[model samples]
Structures are given as C-alpha cells and as structure tokens.
Target: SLNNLQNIIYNPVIPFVGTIPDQLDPGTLIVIRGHVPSDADRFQVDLQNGSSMKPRADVAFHFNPRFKRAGCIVCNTLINEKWGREEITYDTPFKREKSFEIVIMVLKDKFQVAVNGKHTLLYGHRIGPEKIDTLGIYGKVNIHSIGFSF
Candidate 1:
C-alpha cells in the first residue's frame, strides 16, 4: 500500500531509539504517523550519527515541536556535543489531542518537511545525512507507525 517504502514500524515505543537498517542518503524519505496527547508539551525527532550517550552522538538534524503558549518548531544541529544556533518557525501545524503525519524528505542540502500534508519547514544539512545511522524520537509523543523509503 505504501510506495517506495523500504520498511515500516507499527506502534513503536515512545522515547524511541532505533538504528536505521541502512545509512541515510539523498532522496530518502522518513514518514512518522502519530498523535499528540491532551497534555503534550513537546517532542523531538533527531537524526544521529550513532546511539551514544557519554560522548553524545552527533545529531545532524533536531526537529523539536513546542506547544507552549504559542506553538513553534525549533530546529538545531548538535555536533561534537555542542549545539548550534536554533532555527525557530512559528507556523505550528500540530494540535493537542490530534493525529499528525510528518513527512521528512531528504535532499542533498536540506531536509524538507510537511505536516498533515501541509508544507511546514526546511532544515539545512549540518552533518550530511550519510553520517546518520540512528533515529530517535523523544519526549511527549505517541507513534502509530514509522516508514523509511529509500
């Protein structure tokens, strides 16, 4: 039913941390279908070099959604345990107690994103996608499915 889908994970655990079966490359697509709880505060999706704790694996892209007074999306990059400047976009597409489908398209220079079929944001590459091997989704979120298409 899914096109060009390499694989799909159904009902993945929250605070999910999983390795990509294959390394990321240009033209890759990652789709996550999930719902936000009534009391949701924030959640983050991170593309990491590896699943390391001590040294803190490098994060190529960090997409965080904050549902504070006014909602916003914060994008950042973590390299060598140092965080770069945060890129904030106030066009919040997510709602409390709502389901969302987030599609992330990988490109040579940036990652393009859409939420519930609406174009949302673009985050430029800090560390190329090829370096990312781990995908981590954390904080207040419930995932129904995760699909990786090469």
Candidate 2:
C-alpha cells in the first residue's frame, strides 16, 4: 500500500520491465536504487507506454549512461515510431561499482531527475505523460529497490 512504504521491488533482473502500480501524476516521484558494476559499460532506464518488444514500444523518456573512457548521460524521447533529437550530458555523476539513488520527479511538462542529491537533468514531455504506464531498466547494473511516492 502507498501508506505503508512497502511499494518496493528488490533485486530485479536486468532488463527488468514492470508496471507503475498506478498512473503517474504531476507530483509523483519514482525512486530507484542501484549499483553500477565495475565492468559496466552502459545501462538505461526508460519510461514507456508499454513493455512491447523493440521497435514496438514507445518510450517517453530514455535515460542512458555510457561508461566509455569517460562517462556521459544521454536523454531522449521517442514518439510515434521515431526518436527525437538526443540531449547528451557529459556531466557524469555515477562512478564504477558505486551505488546511486535516482529520483525521477514528474511535473506537468517534464521529468526532473536527480542523482544522489544533485539535480541531473530535466526531460521535457514529448509524449503525453499519462500514456506512460511501464518502467524498464536494462543493461549492466545491480538493482536494489524501486519505490514510488506522491
């Protein structure tokens, strides 16, 4: 129940995909706790309309991290069947084999994300937020918990 703070998912498998429990509203907060593997190259967290297979799903917000020689975060939106232009941020707030707390705050026009306690980026709503019912996390990272608040 929302009042019990028991809306938690533990140790979800990679490429984990699940429903949001409830439709997201303007003040909803989605919290994810995870640790990046030492050998991690990249990982992604996506807010999508459905959990359909690739090329069949529509992602409203895509938060991706690429741990190359240096690290960077790439954010984008997918509408209809095409991806909008990407917004890449080279300000890496993640470290290898380190734990992180990512809070995605929903607003009327955008999604605000914070890493640890620092503001990361704001992704404008390219697709209607009400249509976003699924959350997907993929690639090399260890997930601890997923929770929600409003």
Q: Cα deviation of 135 in candidate 1 (Å)? A: 0.3
Cα RMSDs, all models: 1.4, 2.4
Which residue runs of candidate 1 sit more than 4 Å off their true CA positions? none
lDDT of 2 by residue, 1-150 (tens): 135343479999888999989878888888899999999999999999998886658999999988997899999987777888999989979889899999898999999999998999988898888999999999999999999886
Candidate 1 C-alpha lDDT tens digits along 20-135: 88767787889899999999999999999999989999989999999989899999999889999999999889888999998898988999999998889999998878889999
Candidate that would win on lDDT: 1
Candidate number with greatest TM-score: 1
TM-score of 1: 0.95
How many pairs collide in each candidate, listed in order? 0, 0
Clashing pairs in 2: none
Candidate 1 CA-lDDT value: 0.90
lDDT of each: 0.90, 0.89
